[PDB]
Nucleic acid binder design. Sequence first.
RNA 1: CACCUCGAUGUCGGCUCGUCGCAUCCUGGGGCUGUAGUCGGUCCCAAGGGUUGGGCUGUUCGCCCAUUAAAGCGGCACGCGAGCUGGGUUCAGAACGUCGUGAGACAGUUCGGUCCCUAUCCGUCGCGGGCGUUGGAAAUUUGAGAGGAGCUGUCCUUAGUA
RNA 2: UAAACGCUGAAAGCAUCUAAGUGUGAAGCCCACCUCAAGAUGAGAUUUCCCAUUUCUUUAAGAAAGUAAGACCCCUGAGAG
Lengths: 174, 38, 59, 147, 206
Amino acid sequence: SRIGNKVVVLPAGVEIKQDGNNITVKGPKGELTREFSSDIKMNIEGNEVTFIRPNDSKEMKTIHGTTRANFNNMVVGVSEGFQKALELIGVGYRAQVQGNKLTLNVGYSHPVEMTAPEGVTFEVPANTQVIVKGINKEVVGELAANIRGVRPPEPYKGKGIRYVGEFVRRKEGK
Amino acid sequence: MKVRPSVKPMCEHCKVIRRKGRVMVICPANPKHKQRQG
Amino acid sequence: WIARINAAARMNGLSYSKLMHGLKLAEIDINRKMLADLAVNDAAAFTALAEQAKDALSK
Amino acid sequence: MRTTYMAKAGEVERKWYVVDATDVPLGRLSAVVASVLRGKNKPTFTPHVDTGDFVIVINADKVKLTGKKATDKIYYRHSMYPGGLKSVTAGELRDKNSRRLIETSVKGMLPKNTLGRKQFTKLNVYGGAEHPHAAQQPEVLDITNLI
Amino acid sequence: KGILGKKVGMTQIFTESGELIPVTVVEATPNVVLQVKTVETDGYEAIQVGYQDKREVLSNKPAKGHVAKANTAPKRFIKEFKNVELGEYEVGKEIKVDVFQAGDVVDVTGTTKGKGFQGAIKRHGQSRGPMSHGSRYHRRPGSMGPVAPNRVFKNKRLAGRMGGDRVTIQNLEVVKVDVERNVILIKGNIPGAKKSLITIKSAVKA
RNA sequence: CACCUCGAUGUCGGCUCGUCGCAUCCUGGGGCUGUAGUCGGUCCCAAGGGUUGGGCUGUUCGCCCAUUAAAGCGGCACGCGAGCUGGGUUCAGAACGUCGUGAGACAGUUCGGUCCCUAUCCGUCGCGGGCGUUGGAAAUUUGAGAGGAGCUGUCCUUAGUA
RNA sequence: UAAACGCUGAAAGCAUCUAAGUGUGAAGCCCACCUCAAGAUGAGAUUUCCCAUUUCUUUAAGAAAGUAAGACCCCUGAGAG
Ligand SMILES: [K+]
Ligand SMILES: [K+]
Ligand SMILES: [K+]
Ligand SMILES: [K+]
Ligand SMILES: [K+]
Ligand SMILES: [K+]
Ligand SMILES: [K+]
Ligand SMILES: [K+]
Ligand SMILES: [K+]
Ligand SMILES: [Mg+2]
Ligand SMILES: [Mg+2]
Ligand SMILES: [Mg+2]
Ligand SMILES: [Mg+2]
Ligand SMILES: [Mg+2]
Ligand SMILES: [Mg+2]
Ligand SMILES: [Mg+2]
Ligand SMILES: [Mg+2]
Ligand SMILES: [Mg+2]
Ligand SMILES: [Mg+2]
Ligand SMILES: [Mg+2]
Ligand SMILES: [Zn+2]
């Protein structure tokens, strides 16, 4: 029952490069790098990676778990990437993507224009469905949150942008 | 957000946590249970 | 005198408190006026006194 | 007998030291530097005359602020106009003007008199590792053991 | 963009559509770039500009030497312009009113007319005291402050010399430019007495 | 309570001038809502600016009229009388009710009634002289630091849309 | 940056705005706009001008005495007072 002790595998052909800090991961989706802590020691197998903490102090446990999760997310992003799926709901709400530019008409007097960073892209399979797809989970989450915040859900009628499947309490406004 | 000196869980879903040195009660069920110590 | 003796003792690898403790152990009764005079003028003699103090402290 | 030595202005030779502030707590750096500037490190110390040495502080931008001082230690100053209180955090001063940070810390420790102000003028602080006072042939002053 | 001129005076002009607007006539005999300052030599970028040719007997050998580089007669007024493109300017270059066009929005700087020693009522627009009902308090500057400080706070405004200050009016409109007469007509009124120095610059706010 | 002041520390209100605190009246940001919307309620952050003209009364206060985005609460000797006023309160006159046998007095009212001072020092607002800034001069300048400014309505359109 | 809201994230397999990491966010803070400002004795910077004289003392950062560049006295005045 410990993320820090739980091992990390390397499916497909993901590669990892070590360095005093700034551990790097490479694979089909792309590359990633994070300045991992110098205290948690990483052991590498042909396909399995493990993290060990020097002791059992509060700080070592905390940093151990965080680093293991961070490395795991780096590998999983490089392998499969990440995606946030947003489902905008409204009478005339719609979305459309031109390249790395996303235009949202969500009831405001003006459209809302959003720009993806180089590591992220917008799919927009439909006019009411958006998908932020990237490699870095943090970047994907931040972009998805910004899109959602452009017009967050409201309780009475459900209008607004929602993460696909997120629960939305609805009040029975009179 | 109820800002008060006494922050306690109001229902079984309320969870007491600490953010930036302040005691906070965050409840996924009822937003009215959102409390901060202050 | 104490400040000057402190400076000289530090240059000799010793704090004023340690120096005076060592001198008392070594039975040296030279007072602070004379010690400050040696520190400013006769650095060699002051070093000899400091060495005796360090020897006494070691013992 | 009244034979105690009293230094004369101009007879004592003031040296030049270089102090690297990298990761040294601000206060401890200031304390050792203040003693040197006053001349407390030399036997010829005479309270009513200046006998300390010049100090060149380098890497001021890397001085260390333990705890939450970086954002919570506040330097105030009043313009003497009503409501003319200005404040700036120690962290902001370190990032933008670290020379002032070191100088203010050292000013607080030197005496508040004519001799103290003159002794302060012998202080030179430079964020970064290089200074223009090579002509004075300053020598390094390790302080790892002094702090 | 900037220029130095002399506040000739005020008149009014009929625009198209028949509207009537007040204009200030500012004459600017071609200014000359006397020096170019750079980060290399001075640490900041700007151009020194001279205006209003001066009689030689009114100039000094050091002043003549300074203007010799630009190869022009001594100038009465000299000022530095910042936020300009140094590449476009060189010592000896001339600046004419044609640098501006009608409809430009500019900031005009001048030195306010001096009123001399003035009381608080005029100088700071403070309220008089009652003129009757037994009042012996008409044009005085009010209370100096509360008791507790045992002093007077700074900025307790009082009588003193009024005017003669550097004042900038922002967003004035260049109504017209006459290159033949080196005249700029600026909508409105600008600080300074007639024949005083005036500095026109492209509005910073714009 | 009686610690400074009785070889005097001037008392209410108003005027002039403000300045500060935030427990915020408006404007700004936000959480919750028994928040559909327009309005709100409550709480959190926020003191940058602004926060009125009259009738009555000596008044503060308060009621009223008419506005405003708002008409905040307080400290500063209930700020500010060597800056002003002096209507009220505490002198001498006179009168009413009342008490007293009385002179008189208030458990109360009413009419009338001297507000002195040439700024020495600090402080504040302006303006010069001297010297310094390390050869002597003429100009132009960077900006350590400081001050100023900081408010807000209504209408139109988006849209009679959500 | 405040309140507030996060993203990722363990301690605590979950959850979690935080511990590390990372973001949005106010008429408020630092700028931005205006003015003063190197007596900022830390007295800054740039351009230009004058030129190394004379006499006596003493090696003196000596003294004085003519000046140079320049400034002022004095005088006519105002856009200044
Ligand atoms: K008394
Ligand atoms: K609210
Ligand atoms: K405020
Ligand atoms: K009235
Ligand atoms: K007040
Ligand atoms: K009076
Ligand atoms: K008084
Ligand atoms: K005094
Ligand atoms: K100067
Ligand atoms: Mg309770
Ligand atoms: Mg009035
Ligand atoms: Mg005082
Ligand atoms: Mg008693
Ligand atoms: Mg007395
Ligand atoms: Mg508050
Ligand atoms: Mg009072
Ligand atoms: Mg008074
Ligand atoms: Mg009777
Ligand atoms: Mg009574
Ligand atoms: Mg009468
Ligand atoms: Zn709950």
